[PDB]
Amino acid sequence: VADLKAFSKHIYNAYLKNFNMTKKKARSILTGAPFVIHDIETLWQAEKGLVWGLPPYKEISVHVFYRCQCTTVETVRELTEFAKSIPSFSSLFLNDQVTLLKYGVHEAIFAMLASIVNKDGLLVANGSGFVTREFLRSLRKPFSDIIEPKFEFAVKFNALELDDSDLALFIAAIILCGDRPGLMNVPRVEAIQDTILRALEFHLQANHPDAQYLFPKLLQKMADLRQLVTEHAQMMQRIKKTETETSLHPLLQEIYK
C-alpha cells in the first residue's frame, strides 16, 4: 500500500513536469480573458495575433483540421516525455515504448481534452483562446463529425470530477496497456499496468472517499476511449480517402500507418 502511494506521487510529479496545461490551470481559465473564436472573422483575428506555419492556406474547415493536427502533435510529444518519467517505461524494449506510444497517445489525448473543455467549447493556444463548440459544429463534414463525439465523451468524463493527481495515474494506465498489438514483452507491460491500476484504486479511495464505484467507472471510460479512437481512426481513414488536398503531419502519418 505504501509503495503504491509513492508510485502515485512519482507519476503525479511526472505529469506536473511534462504537461503545459493542467486541469487545475484550465478550470481556473474557464471559470475566470481568452479570446472567443466563434466564427470566420474571429478566427482570422486570432491568427493575426490575439491568439497565434500550417500547410498553405485553403478553406476554414481544413484550416481548423490543421490546427487540430498541430495541437495533437504537440500533445504526443508531451506524452512521450511524460511516459519516459513513468518508472519502468524507459527500461522496456525501445520497440515496446514506440508501440505503447503509437497505440495509446490518442486515447490519452482524448482523455486529457476533457480537462480543457466545457459544454460550450474548449481552450486553445495554452488558454489564450476559446473555440466554441457551436463554431466547430458549423464546419463542413467530415470535419464537424470527427470533432463532436470528443465533446460528447469529455462532458460525461467531466461529470466524474477527476483532478490532476487522478488523471496522471489514469493517463499512465492508458499508455502502459498490455493489449497493444506487436508487443515484445507482454507480461512485463501487463505487470506495470496492473501496478498503476492498483495504485489508482488506492489513490481514489483516498482522494475521493465518498464517490461510489469510481474505480470501475474509470475502467469503463478506458474501454469507451478505445472505442472512441477506433471510430476516430475510421474517420481519419475516410478523410485521407476523400479529402485529397488535405495533408497530415508526418508524426501523425507514422502513428496511423
Next chain:
Amino acid sequence: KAFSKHIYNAYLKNFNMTKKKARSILTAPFVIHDIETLWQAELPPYKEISVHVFYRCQCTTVETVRELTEFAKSIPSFSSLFLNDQVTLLKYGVHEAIFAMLASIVNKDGLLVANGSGFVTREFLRSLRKPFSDIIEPKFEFAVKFNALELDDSDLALFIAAIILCGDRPGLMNVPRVEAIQDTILRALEFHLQANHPDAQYLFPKLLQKMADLRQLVTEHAQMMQRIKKTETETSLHPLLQEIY
C-alpha cells in the same frame, strides 16, 4: 571518499568475518579433510555425509543473507527505493555477494568454516558425492582468481554494495534510480582503487568483469540448485532459500 569510508564502516559493522581476520588465521584452525575429522568437528536430521555438508552450506549462506540485508540499509538511498525493489535487489544479488565474499575465507587448499576455527580442504569437498561436489568446486575456481586481484576489506565493501545495486535485475520498478545509486558506488570504487592500489593497473575494469563473472556463476548455481531440488527429493532447503529460488 567519505562515501567509501561510510560503506567500509557499514561492512565492518555487518560481517563478523573480514578478509583481514581470515588472512591472519590462514597464515590454528582444525583441518577437516575426511569423515573422521568431520565427525570430530561436529540443522535438518542426519542423512548422509554429503547432505550434511550441504546443510552446513545452507546455514552459512542463510546467515550471510541476513547480514547482507542489514548491510544494504546503510548503502545511501537504498532504504528510499520501493520496498518491492529492495526485496528484488536482495533476492537477485545476495548470492553474487556471498560468492564474492567467499574468496575472503578461501585459499587454493580449502576454506575457513565456523569462525576462524575450522579449515575444510577443497580435496574433501571434491570427495563428496555428485551433485554436491559439483555445486561446490566452481566457487573455489572463481575465488582463487578473485584473490589474485588482492583486494582488502575496504575495497570489498564497495564491490559488494555495487553488486547489490544492480539495475539489471528482473521485475525492478525504478531502474534509473537504482542505476544512479550504483553509479555513485562505482565512482567511489574507481576513486578508491586509485588511492588504495596506486600501482595496480586496470583493477577497476577488471572488477567490472568479476561482476559479470559472478552473474554467470550464480546462474550456473541456481541451475544446480534446481536439479538437486528434483533429483535429491530427500534433502530439504531452508525456506529463506526456497523464496530466493
